[PDB]
Enzyme design. Structure first.
Site, PDB file in Angstrom:
ATOM      1  N   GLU A 173       0.779  -1.222   0.000  1.00  0.00           N
ATOM      2  CA  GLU A 173       0.000   0.000   0.000  1.00  0.00           C
ATOM      3  C   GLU A 173       0.822   1.290   0.000  1.00  0.00           C
ATOM      4  N   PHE A 216      -1.257 -14.587  -0.760  1.00  0.00           N
ATOM      5  CA  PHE A 216      -0.116 -15.083   0.028  1.00  0.00           C
ATOM      6  C   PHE A 216       0.286 -16.475  -0.432  1.00  0.00           C
ATOM      7  N   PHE A 217       1.493 -16.597  -0.976  1.00  0.00           N
ATOM      8  CA  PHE A 217       1.878 -17.873  -1.563  1.00  0.00           C
ATOM      9  C   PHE A 217       2.853 -18.656  -0.698  1.00  0.00           C
ATOM     10  N   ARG A 218       3.710 -17.962   0.054  1.00  0.00           N
ATOM     11  CA  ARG A 218       4.733 -18.677   0.818  1.00  0.00           C
ATOM     12  C   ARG A 218       5.054 -17.817   2.017  1.00  0.00           C
TER      13      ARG A 218
HETATM   14  C1  LIG Z   1      -1.815 -20.595   1.692  1.00  0.00           C
HETATM   15  C2  LIG Z   1      -0.934 -21.824   1.467  1.00  0.00           C
HETATM   16  C3  LIG Z   1      -0.914 -22.650   2.740  1.00  0.00           C
HETATM   17  C4  LIG Z   1      -1.578 -22.663   0.358  1.00  0.00           C
HETATM   18  O1  LIG Z   1      -0.619 -23.538  -0.220  1.00  0.00           O
HETATM   19  P1  LIG Z   1      -0.211 -23.506  -1.788  1.00  0.00           P
HETATM   20  O2  LIG Z   1      -0.517 -22.215  -2.533  1.00  0.00           O
HETATM   21  O3  LIG Z   1      -0.703 -24.816  -2.385  1.00  0.00           O
HETATM   22  O4  LIG Z   1       1.413 -23.621  -1.670  1.00  0.00           O
HETATM   23  P2  LIG Z   1       1.951 -24.995  -1.000  1.00  0.00           P
HETATM   24  O5  LIG Z   1       0.798 -25.670  -0.238  1.00  0.00           O
HETATM   25  O6  LIG Z   1       2.607 -25.668  -2.166  1.00  0.00           O
HETATM   26  O7  LIG Z   1       3.138 -24.544  -0.005  1.00  0.00           O
HETATM   27  C5  LIG Z   1       3.881 -23.340  -0.202  1.00  0.00           C
HETATM   28  C6  LIG Z   1       4.476 -23.027   1.173  1.00  0.00           C
HETATM   29  O8  LIG Z   1       3.471 -22.787   2.158  1.00  0.00           O
HETATM   30  C7  LIG Z   1       3.730 -23.412   3.420  1.00  0.00           C
HETATM   31  N1  LIG Z   1       2.741 -24.464   3.783  1.00  0.00           N
HETATM   32  C8  LIG Z   1       1.862 -25.101   2.989  1.00  0.00           C
HETATM   33  N2  LIG Z   1       1.152 -25.997   3.720  1.00  0.00           N
HETATM   34  C9  LIG Z   1       1.605 -25.913   4.990  1.00  0.00           C
HETATM   35  C10 LIG Z   1       1.271 -26.565   6.172  1.00  0.00           C
HETATM   36  N3  LIG Z   1       0.296 -27.508   6.159  1.00  0.00           N
HETATM   37  N4  LIG Z   1       1.932 -26.244   7.313  1.00  0.00           N
HETATM   38  C11 LIG Z   1       2.901 -25.316   7.308  1.00  0.00           C
HETATM   39  N5  LIG Z   1       3.254 -24.673   6.185  1.00  0.00           N
HETATM   40  C12 LIG Z   1       2.614 -24.954   5.020  1.00  0.00           C
HETATM   41  C13 LIG Z   1       5.075 -24.090   3.265  1.00  0.00           C
HETATM   42  O9  LIG Z   1       6.015 -23.096   3.660  1.00  0.00           O
HETATM   43  C14 LIG Z   1       5.132 -24.263   1.759  1.00  0.00           C
HETATM   44  O10 LIG Z   1       6.461 -24.372   1.293  1.00  0.00           O
HETATM   45  P3  LIG Z   1       7.086 -25.851   1.445  1.00  0.00           P
HETATM   46  O11 LIG Z   1       7.690 -25.879   2.830  1.00  0.00           O
HETATM   47  O12 LIG Z   1       5.926 -26.821   1.389  1.00  0.00           O
HETATM   48  O13 LIG Z   1       8.030 -25.860   0.257  1.00  0.00           O
HETATM   49  C15 LIG Z   1       0.496 -21.386   1.169  1.00  0.00           C
HETATM   50  O14 LIG Z   1       0.360 -20.658  -0.052  1.00  0.00           O
HETATM   51  C16 LIG Z   1       0.976 -20.413   2.235  1.00  0.00           C
HETATM   52  O15 LIG Z   1       1.332 -20.788   3.343  1.00  0.00           O
HETATM   53  N6  LIG Z   1       0.987 -19.095   2.012  1.00  0.00           N
HETATM   54  C17 LIG Z   1       1.431 -18.142   3.011  1.00  0.00           C
HETATM   55  C18 LIG Z   1       0.399 -17.823   4.091  1.00  0.00           C
HETATM   56  C19 LIG Z   1       0.764 -16.591   4.881  1.00  0.00           C
HETATM   57  O16 LIG Z   1       1.926 -16.439   5.223  1.00  0.00           O
HETATM   58  N7  LIG Z   1      -0.198 -15.734   5.240  1.00  0.00           N
HETATM   59  C20 LIG Z   1       0.173 -14.636   6.127  1.00  0.00           C
HETATM   60  C21 LIG Z   1       0.365 -14.973   7.616  1.00  0.00           C
HETATM   61  S1  LIG Z   1      -0.973 -15.874   8.354  1.00  0.00           S
HETATM   62  C22 LIG Z   1      -2.295 -14.772   8.696  1.00  0.00           C
HETATM   63  C23 LIG Z   1      -1.912 -13.572   9.526  1.00  0.00           C
HETATM   64  O17 LIG Z   1      -1.383 -12.567   9.065  1.00  0.00           O
HETATM   65  C24 LIG Z   1      -2.193 -13.623  11.007  1.00  0.00           C
HETATM   66  C25 LIG Z   1      -1.913 -12.486  11.749  1.00  0.00           C
HETATM   67  C26 LIG Z   1      -2.167 -12.467  13.114  1.00  0.00           C
HETATM   68  C27 LIG Z   1      -2.651 -13.615  13.719  1.00  0.00           C
HETATM   69  O18 LIG Z   1      -2.839 -13.556  15.060  1.00  0.00           O
HETATM   70  C28 LIG Z   1      -2.952 -14.754  12.977  1.00  0.00           C
HETATM   71  C29 LIG Z   1      -2.704 -14.769  11.610  1.00  0.00           C
HETATM   72  C1  LIG Z   2     -10.977   6.417  -2.447  1.00  0.00           C
HETATM   73  C2  LIG Z   2     -11.885   7.644  -2.375  1.00  0.00           C
HETATM   74  C3  LIG Z   2     -11.149   8.975  -2.462  1.00  0.00           C
HETATM   75  C4  LIG Z   2     -12.879   7.481  -3.525  1.00  0.00           C
HETATM   76  O1  LIG Z   2     -13.968   8.361  -3.289  1.00  0.00           O
HETATM   77  P1  LIG Z   2     -15.503   7.842  -3.434  1.00  0.00           P
HETATM   78  O2  LIG Z   2     -15.655   6.335  -3.397  1.00  0.00           O
HETATM   79  O3  LIG Z   2     -16.021   8.650  -4.624  1.00  0.00           O
HETATM   80  O4  LIG Z   2     -16.030   8.460  -2.022  1.00  0.00           O
HETATM   81  P2  LIG Z   2     -16.352  10.045  -1.917  1.00  0.00           P
HETATM   82  O5  LIG Z   2     -15.561  10.716  -3.034  1.00  0.00           O
HETATM   83  O6  LIG Z   2     -17.844  10.095  -1.975  1.00  0.00           O
HETATM   84  O7  LIG Z   2     -15.818  10.513  -0.472  1.00  0.00           O
HETATM   85  C5  LIG Z   2     -15.843   9.666   0.675  1.00  0.00           C
HETATM   86  C6  LIG Z   2     -14.868  10.345   1.628  1.00  0.00           C
HETATM   87  O8  LIG Z   2     -13.552  10.273   1.076  1.00  0.00           O
HETATM   88  C7  LIG Z   2     -12.798  11.468   1.273  1.00  0.00           C
HETATM   89  N1  LIG Z   2     -12.515  12.094  -0.050  1.00  0.00           N
HETATM   90  C8  LIG Z   2     -13.042  11.793  -1.243  1.00  0.00           C
HETATM   91  N2  LIG Z   2     -12.479  12.591  -2.180  1.00  0.00           N
HETATM   92  C9  LIG Z   2     -11.612  13.420  -1.554  1.00  0.00           C
HETATM   93  C10 LIG Z   2     -10.752  14.437  -1.965  1.00  0.00           C
HETATM   94  N3  LIG Z   2     -10.663  14.821  -3.269  1.00  0.00           N
HETATM   95  N4  LIG Z   2     -10.006  15.060  -1.025  1.00  0.00           N
HETATM   96  C11 LIG Z   2     -10.053  14.734   0.273  1.00  0.00           C
HETATM   97  N5  LIG Z   2     -10.878  13.766   0.688  1.00  0.00           N
HETATM   98  C12 LIG Z   2     -11.648  13.096  -0.208  1.00  0.00           C
HETATM   99  C13 LIG Z   2     -13.703  12.346   2.107  1.00  0.00           C
HETATM  100  O9  LIG Z   2     -13.501  11.882   3.443  1.00  0.00           O
HETATM  101  C14 LIG Z   2     -15.050  11.851   1.609  1.00  0.00           C
HETATM  102  O10 LIG Z   2     -16.083  12.164   2.513  1.00  0.00           O
HETATM  103  P3  LIG Z   2     -16.751  13.626   2.404  1.00  0.00           P
HETATM  104  O11 LIG Z   2     -15.808  14.547   3.148  1.00  0.00           O
HETATM  105  O12 LIG Z   2     -16.883  13.945   0.928  1.00  0.00           O
HETATM  106  O13 LIG Z   2     -18.066  13.326   3.088  1.00  0.00           O
HETATM  107  C15 LIG Z   2     -12.642   7.659  -1.045  1.00  0.00           C
HETATM  108  O14 LIG Z   2     -13.460   6.479  -1.041  1.00  0.00           O
HETATM  109  C16 LIG Z   2     -11.626   7.525   0.061  1.00  0.00           C
HETATM  110  O15 LIG Z   2     -11.097   8.569   0.425  1.00  0.00           O
HETATM  111  N6  LIG Z   2     -11.375   6.339   0.640  1.00  0.00           N
HETATM  112  C17 LIG Z   2     -10.306   6.092   1.615  1.00  0.00           C
HETATM  113  C18 LIG Z   2      -8.886   6.070   1.072  1.00  0.00           C
HETATM  114  C19 LIG Z   2      -8.023   5.598   2.238  1.00  0.00           C
HETATM  115  O16 LIG Z   2      -8.187   5.972   3.395  1.00  0.00           O
HETATM  116  N7  LIG Z   2      -7.024   4.771   1.952  1.00  0.00           N
HETATM  117  C20 LIG Z   2      -6.034   4.279   2.914  1.00  0.00           C
HETATM  118  C21 LIG Z   2      -5.060   5.415   3.262  1.00  0.00           C
HETATM  119  S1  LIG Z   2      -4.176   6.089   1.872  1.00  0.00           S
HETATM  120  C22 LIG Z   2      -3.025   4.834   1.419  1.00  0.00           C
HETATM  121  C23 LIG Z   2      -2.019   4.408   2.469  1.00  0.00           C
HETATM  122  O17 LIG Z   2      -2.288   3.548   3.311  1.00  0.00           O
HETATM  123  C24 LIG Z   2      -0.690   5.092   2.512  1.00  0.00           C
HETATM  124  C25 LIG Z   2       0.213   4.605   3.452  1.00  0.00           C
HETATM  125  C26 LIG Z   2       1.472   5.194   3.561  1.00  0.00           C
HETATM  126  C27 LIG Z   2       1.794   6.268   2.719  1.00  0.00           C
HETATM  127  O18 LIG Z   2       3.020   6.843   2.863  1.00  0.00           O
HETATM  128  C28 LIG Z   2       0.894   6.768   1.782  1.00  0.00           C
HETATM  129  C29 LIG Z   2      -0.340   6.123   1.634  1.00  0.00           C
END
Ligand SMILES: CC(C)(COP(=O)(O)OP(=O)(O)OC[C@H]1O[C@@H](n2cnc3c(N)ncnc32)[C@H](O)[C@@H]1OP(=O)(O)O)[C@@H](O)C(=O)NCCC(=O)NCCSCC(=O)c1ccc(O)cc1
Ligand SMILES: CC(C)(COP(=O)(O)OP(=O)(O)OC[C@H]1O[C@@H](n2cnc3c(N)ncnc32)[C@H](O)[C@@H]1OP(=O)(O)O)[C@@H](O)C(=O)NCCC(=O)NCCSCC(=O)c1ccc(O)cc1
Ligand SMILES: CC(C)(COP(=O)(O)OP(=O)(O)OC[C@H]1O[C@@H](n2cnc3c(N)ncnc32)[C@H](O)[C@@H]1OP(=O)(O)O)[C@@H](O)C(=O)NCCC(=O)NCCSCC(=O)c1ccc(O)cc1
Ligand SMILES: CC(C)(COP(=O)(O)OP(=O)(O)OC[C@H]1O[C@@H](n2cnc3c(N)ncnc32)[C@H](O)[C@@H]1OP(=O)(O)O)[C@@H](O)C(=O)NCCC(=O)NCCSCC(=O)c1ccc(O)cc1
Lengths: 140, 140, 140, 140
Positions: free
Chosen positions: A62, A89-91
């Site tokens: 992002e 998420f692949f690995r």
């Molecule tokens: C989603 C999936 C399991 C699906 O598998 P796939 O696309 O068929 O790929 P594949 O199964 O061939 O395995 C690829 C790799 O995934 C891992 N993996 C797959 N199955 C397993 C399993 N059963 N147990 C452990 N690791 C596995 C493993 O590293 C594998 O490489 P290898 O050691 O087998 O060479 C695999 O793509 C993957 O693990 N992706 C990464 C998932 C990931 O890291 N997501 C983000 C973190 S988890 C979510 C999270 O953010 C979170 C945050 C806070 C919290 O409190 C809880 C969760």
């Molecule tokens: C995406 C978009 C601008 C599209 O607009 P839309 O679907 O037509 O919605 P709409 O234009 O009706 O406005 C909804 C609200 O968005 C805001 N907004 C919309 N257009 C504008 C604009 N031209 N200027 C300021 N605010 C606006 C405003 O809050 C508006 O409410 P209101 O004040 O008009 O009542 C609006 O939906 C939006 O603002 N969504 C949220 C975007 C957001 O918060 N993204 C995540 C943060 S930015 C990405 C990021 O994470 C980042 C991280 C690190 C970094 O260094 C830089 C970026």
């Protein structure tokens, strides 16, 4: 800072206090069509099972996609905000670094689209993010 | 610490050291079909432009949907990891809290799918996340 | 026609010749916040393995979300086009019908977002689609 | 018929009767890491406003990514079905052809992921689709 594009004299939040600075994101390269960034894995990037948090990959993608858009459009009077983030998420990553490369694939008047690849220290593709960035006239 | 489900006697990384503990995510309700969590907005959650970071909504949805799955499947010998996270951003949040409600919509044998709404303190829908969670047998 | 919103005196393509009419989509209900549609399964909706084509669910969601937006915004001088379609597939459909319900979850000035649920004849959730619809001033 | 991979001696539904045969999808190149297909635009591919239907890009990506997986895994006893299809639309196509190029980016044991570009006759990127394909053992 994390080397974010220098486009304004003041920012509401200092780098080191944002989520970006807290987890340690740093931009390496930036051009209008391609940008790169990276982060060291620390526990702050992890979830409690010891893997990089899914949200860390999403947040890296992002900031990189959004700021690479800001770098072009801010001087044109526009703001750029994330509109959609789809990360798949692949690995898992347990330690080392996560390196992101964002390639711009569409630059429309209201939306820019970036493909982001997230790789581990061995170069393996661990996640991808399709970033859609809304570009709007800056509000007074 | 953040009231995550207690499904194991120890975890690799302590709550307060994880991303989730660092930004302050806290789980409120947790059932097999629905879970809620919230976070107080501080700079740690924001990006440099002063808005909640897109990555923070992604991360809150990610943890909540994954851990809500964990709560059910861990005792069945499964792990649950995020496979896909699609978050769309409708309105920015500048301060207050972000409150996440996760509703389960499909529970297959390999994939559970959760819809997560992220609302601001006035109740407005600021972001949504569609979370696909892979369920697989634990390797140990 | 398939009962699409009657907003103009002429359309570039007749219903029965569009993809919609060719596969047989018909809108049942339509309000600003909620719309429904359905289709009989025939081979024209299928792929060669005999299941409903993944593209059929995507196309049903796309026309329903887009036209439910057109129904509101066309008279206001705006056009509405699909910008993103994310459909996820939970259970296949081999015969009968596919019924879609689109619920509007955000209506912004430039983007409307619809959650679409795709159900089989037993009421089971077979797929979902998160539809993002771009709304722009109509070009002369 | 549409040059889909020949991996079985018979199929449930003949090419010309399927969605794909009805709208006219044809596979050009097919390898384990890359595949291409194209379709001539006719009203059958369009919606009533005269543009290629969002569903048609989704369907072309869906068939191509799934069948490209099928070509590899069928002889290994697996089936391959679409699990997630995220298509984003950048430019409309009014006529000519839509040409799809699918590039494999991850081949796991349960999930293969393909990036599909959909271009118009001038080579412009009009839509992209991120295709997640579930690979599972065939039930017979
Ligand atoms: C989603 C999936 C399991 C699906 O598998 P796939 O696309 O068929 O790929 P594949 O199964 O061939 O395995 C690829 C790799 O995934 C891992 N993996 C797959 N199955 C397993 C399993 N059963 N147990 C452990 N690791 C596995 C493993 O590293 C594998 O490489 P290898 O050691 O087998 O060479 C695999 O793509 C993957 O693990 N992706 C990464 C998932 C990931 O890291 N997501 C983000 C973190 S988890 C979510 C999270 O953010 C979170 C945050 C806070 C919290 O409190 C809880 C969760
Ligand atoms: C995406 C978009 C601008 C599209 O607009 P839309 O679907 O037509 O919605 P709409 O234009 O009706 O406005 C909804 C609200 O968005 C805001 N907004 C919309 N257009 C504008 C604009 N031209 N200027 C300021 N605010 C606006 C405003 O809050 C508006 O409410 P209101 O004040 O008009 O009542 C609006 O939906 C939006 O603002 N969504 C949220 C975007 C957001 O918060 N993204 C995540 C943060 S930015 C990405 C990021 O994470 C980042 C991280 C690190 C970094 O260094 C830089 C970026
Ligand atoms: C979505 C959006 C309007 C967003 O615009 P953007 O990302 O800012 O791109 P930009 O505005 O720079 O324009 C790109 C091209 O889009 C077109 N476009 C953009 N804005 C407009 C507009 N206000 N009026 C007419 N055309 C426009 C135009 O072709 C433009 O190129 P150019 O003539 O300006 O060189 C543009 O990317 C786009 O038009 N994408 C394609 C939308 C599409 O084709 N979706 C699928 C068909 S509509 C959905 C559907 O399937 C359906 C089915 C049945 C049914 O009954 C109803 C609907
Ligand atoms: C994707 C997945 C296999 C993942 O499974 P899951 O989320 O864990 O759910 P689970 O495995 O519990 O099974 C749910 C249902 O899926 C089906 N299923 C699951 N595994 C299998 C299998 N190994 N063999 C046959 N059916 C299965 C089965 O109907 C099951 O219900 P049940 O009979 O087991 O009660 C399941 O969600 C599913 O089948 N979803 C539907 C897939 C779908 O229909 N996609 C669209 C059509 S295929 C892609 C396409 O459009 C195409 C077009 C042209 C072309 O030439 C080729 C392809």
């Amino acid at each position: 800072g994390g080397n974010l594009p220098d486009v304004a004299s003041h920012y509401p939040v200092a780098y080191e206090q944002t989520l970006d600075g807290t987890v340690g994101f740093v931009i390496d390269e930036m051009t209008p069509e391609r940008a790169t960034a990276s982060v060291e894995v620390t526990d702050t990037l992890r979830q409690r099972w010891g893997l990089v948090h899914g949200g860390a990959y999403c947040a890296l993608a992002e900031m990189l996609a959004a700021e690479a858009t800001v770098a072009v459009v801010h001087e044109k009077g526009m703001m750029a905000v994330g509109q959609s983030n789809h990360t798949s998420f692949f690995r898992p990553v347990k330690e080392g670094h996560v390196r992101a490369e964002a390639v711009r694939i569409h630059a429309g008047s209201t939306t820019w689209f970036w493909d982001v690849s997230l790789r581990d220290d061995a170069g393996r593709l661990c996640a991808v993010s399709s970033m859609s960035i809304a570009v709007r006239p800056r509000r007074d």
